[PDB]
Design a protein around this ligand. Structure first.
Ligand SMILES: [Zn+2]
Length: 224
């Protein structure tokens, strides 16, 4: 183990994790481009939202200027969670923020949707997870795209981020994105930093991307 316990999470942090992974809508677009920037580790997509009530622009945060350079001016696809609190950079009051979630558009379409096999163990006992739970059309997919989908299932099925009072029985948990061609990426399900979206989502700022072709996800949940 030696993972964070949900009881170590404070007041609003648990509620906001449920907000992010269960209630909020996700930014999901194909074929966008921009060379606009706010700070040098960001890329500003002016007019990203066309139907949104409150928002207009999307400011994407990356780990460094080096990562920005790989996407700036190129045609890209986006899939990620965004927040409006403590966000600014474009149109005043109508700017939404996101960490990573950007992949190159050209030659990344798979002929058919790839269904990512999920292996799940609740207190050692294996549980069957439907194959259409986590899926993608990208050859190189951000871990964020996959994580958002997996955690929603965990919410629906296990009330992952509900307080104990509300049948939230899982206390510790881990998600592992196992690829055959590189080392695993694994997140502690209760290891987010802070209480708000602006800090809880920083885990995706590295824009970690993985080959979806022949990989799987392992999820280990514990009720104590
Ligand atoms: Zn595995």
């Amino acid at each position: 183990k030696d993972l964070r316990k949900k009881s170590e999470l404070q007041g609003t942090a648990l509620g906001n994790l449920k907000q992010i992974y269960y209630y909020n809508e996700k930014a999901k677009t194909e074929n966008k481009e921009s060379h606009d920037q706010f700070l040098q580790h960001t890329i500003l997509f002016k007019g990203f939202f066309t139907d949104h009530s409150w928002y207009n622009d999307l400011l994407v945060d990356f780990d460094s200027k080096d990562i920005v350079d790989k996407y700036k001016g190129k045609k890209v696809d986006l899939y990620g969670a965004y927040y409006g609190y403590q966000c600014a950079g474009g149109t005043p009051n109508k700017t939404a923020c996101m960490y990573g979630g950007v992949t190159l558009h050209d030659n990344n379409r798979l002929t058919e949707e790839k269904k990512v096999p999920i292996n799940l163990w609740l207190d050692g006992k294996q549980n069957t997870v439907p194959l259409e739970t986590v899926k993608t059309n990208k050859k190189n997919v951000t871990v964020q795209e996959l994580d958002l989908q997996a955690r929603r299932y965990l919410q629906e099925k296990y009330n992952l981020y509900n307080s104990d009072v509300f049948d939230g029985k899982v206390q510790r948990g881990l998600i592992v994105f196992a690829t055959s061609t590189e080392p695993s990426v694994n997140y502690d399900l209760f290891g987010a930093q802070g209480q708000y979206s602006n800090t809880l989502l920083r885990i995706y700022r590295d824009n970690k991307t993985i080959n979806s072709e022949n990989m799987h996800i392992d999820i280990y949940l514990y009720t104590s």
